[PDB]
Design a protein around this ligand. Structure first.
Ligand code: NAD
Ligand code: NAD
Ligand code: TYD
Lengths: 329, 330
């Protein structure tokens, strides 16, 4: 029998940044009505996967080192889980510009593999976690869930293809999959290739920070804990075949973000280097999340508070990030 | 076009299939003015749907390579020197995608990434990704322009849309000179007889039943393969990098109307039409507007009644080609 008297939750990509946050919160009892959960984490431990992100919750977590593209493995491990969440993906735009083959393999073929295995296993609730970048760029105003897909980068096009095959399963078979799309996340345990942890860890070592292009690109920032609470709202109250935005609550140019980061670590603008722009760089992302707010989601982490906590986290976790910075350097 | 060599050199992935082989046969025959004496490379993995018989008449003008568009190493050695790359390679049967879509995502998405990346490194100046009206979903009234949102419903359509999206991301990120075409249902000689028109023709010619699914009120816009290929060639000659181009169908028919036309065209009876329950992944209506490409000079030449009659005559005269295919399908 593959299920007992507590909920059983399957988290693909659960050794990464957002997925491990979701697992740690679920196990800690942060989501009401999900107490004493059994959690299965499936993660292939790419450069971004890190078992240190789960080291405190191994009594509740069954870890499976494997790939979402492995359909035989999924058929063996999925049965008995009440919820499947897919955080597994290649997620760095600059890596996708250098080589996108693994982005299409994991972010599209892997979604087909997981959705098909969920269909056969009868998993009753499935969440495909996705991104605002599938919409391209928006100069003014915000995207609602009806906005057309127009991805510009290979990462965003791969995420969009994954959403499209998941939605095709919902529409063709009645697969009970829901899509979430969110702004840029930040918080503890983010791999330090993304702009906030890269800038923080470099400033903490007295190194320079590389500001792409003219610095006027706009991102809408959300703390990972609010992203995961939005995802849990979708788990508990969303409907099959629907997309749900989870919006940021700090819309900043990269110049403004840089000012906030420098202020939070006592840094100086003399550390900021202008560097050539990213190819095809998206100018601006903005989401409206009225749809999910109507189901009771509300962010709890103001950017000033979340950034202060995140600076404190990186300041205290050199043991975790120094080996990652060393390799990337 | 300024060919790199003395004659143009055209690379056709999926050129042993239905539409791709028609394109090759027309190009070799000189049907496209300005493209005579071309050297043609056909790359095709010969799935259940590939057929070297489709290229029998152009054997001595075509270099055939049995290979997969996902084979980036092969593409890196075969692509250099080609002026144009056209990608007809795909899994294309909706009902097959309902049974198992894994190969649809592999060929129709990963295979497009593979081909675009190899084209980037090889410096190919003109690339055409052949795609489908099904990426837009269903439309109750009117026709889709090229700015219509992608909203595919079936696994086949979602896979084709995923391929278009990564192709367009290469156009936007690198300036890759790729163009996308989208078209409704094709028919004509050498179509594999799993598709509705050759399925009906070959079954009726053997005195067997033909299946009509559901209420039969699904609507499709039909185009003869030769007009589709001339639209594709218009995109080759007049299109622009990063742009989508529709090629419309000039016979809009319910499946009830299509069934009547097919029965009439072969002399069959409604007694042969087996009514069967609806199936899962077929949209209510597709319709494209092709004003954009018509402004670049495209115009269809085959009216449906004449093209259907030609196609019936072709299947009657080419049992040697389709009988093994029908036998295997059962
Ligand atoms: N980080 C953001 O700002 C952001 C914003 C919106 C959406 N998202 C989405 O949220 C998801 C998680 O993002 P993240 O920042 O935590 O990513 P991450 O890069 O920190 O971690 C990715 C995880 O996926 C694992 N993985 C990769 N490929 C796999 C495969 N084929 N099989 C199994 N595991 C695999 C990796 O080992 C790793 O643990 C992703 O789908 C991403 O697209 C992220
Ligand atoms: N048939 C239609 O009605 C129609 C309408 C609009 C668009 N299209 C598109 O036009 C293209 C051609 O369609 P068709 O009707 O000729 O398809 P088809 O089924 O007749 O032939 C597909 C060809 O692709 C080959 N192939 C498949 N996967 C391959 C791979 N990974 N590598 C190399 N070769 C591979 C097959 O061997 C075969 O020869 C496809 O992209 C299809 O999506 C078709
Ligand atoms: C990693 C990085 C990003 N950026 C910019 C690019 C984006 O506008 C923003 C966030 O980039 P990133 O963290 O890569 O996320 P995403 O591409 O998902 O938005 O910061 C830099 O200026 N420098 C850097 O070193």
């Amino acid at each position: 029998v593959p299920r007992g008297s507590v909920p059983r939750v399957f988290v693909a990509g659960g050794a990464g940044f957002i997925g491990s946050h979701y697992v740690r919160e679920l196990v800690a009892g942060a989501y009401a009505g999900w107490q004493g959960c059994e959690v299965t984490v499936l993660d292939s431990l790419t450069y971004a996967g890190n078992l240190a992100n789960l080291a405190g919750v191994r009594d509740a977590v069954t870890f499976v080192r494997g790939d979402i593209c492995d359909g035989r493995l999924l058929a063996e491990v999925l049965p008995g889980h009440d919820v499947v969440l897919n955080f597994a993906a290649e997620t760095h735009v600059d890596r996708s510009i250098a080589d996108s083959a693994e982005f299409l393999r994991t972010n599209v073929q892997g979604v087909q593999s997981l959705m098909q295995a969920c269909l056969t296993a009868g998993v009753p609730t499935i969440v495909q976690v996705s991104t605002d970048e599938v919409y391209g760029s928006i100069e003014a105003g915000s995207w609602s869930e009806d906005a057309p897909l127009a991805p510009n980068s290979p990462y965003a096009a791969a995420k969009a293809g994954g959403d499209l095959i998941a939605l095709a399963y919902a529409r063709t078979y009645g697969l009970p999959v829901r899509i979430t799309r969110c702004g840029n996340n930040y918080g503890p345990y983010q791999f330090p290739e993304k702009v906030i942890p890269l800038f923080l860890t470099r400033l903490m070592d007295g190194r320079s920070v590389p500001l792409y292009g003219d610095g006027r690109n706009v991102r809408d920032w959300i703390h990972v804990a609010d992203h995961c609470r939005g995802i849990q709202t979708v788990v508990e109250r969303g409907a099959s075949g629907e997309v749900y935005h989870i919006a940021g609550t700090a819309e900043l140019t990269n110049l403004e973000l840089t000012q906030h980061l420098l202020d939070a670590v006592g840094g100086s603008w003399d550390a900021v280097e202008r560097v050539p722009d990213r190819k095809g760089h998206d100018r601006r992302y903005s989401l409206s999340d009225a749809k999910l707010r109507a189901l009771g989601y509300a962010p709890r982490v103001p950017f000033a508070d979340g950034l202060a906590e995140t600076v404190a986290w990186y300041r205290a976790n050199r043991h975790w990030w120094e080996p990652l910075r060393k390799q990337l350097d």
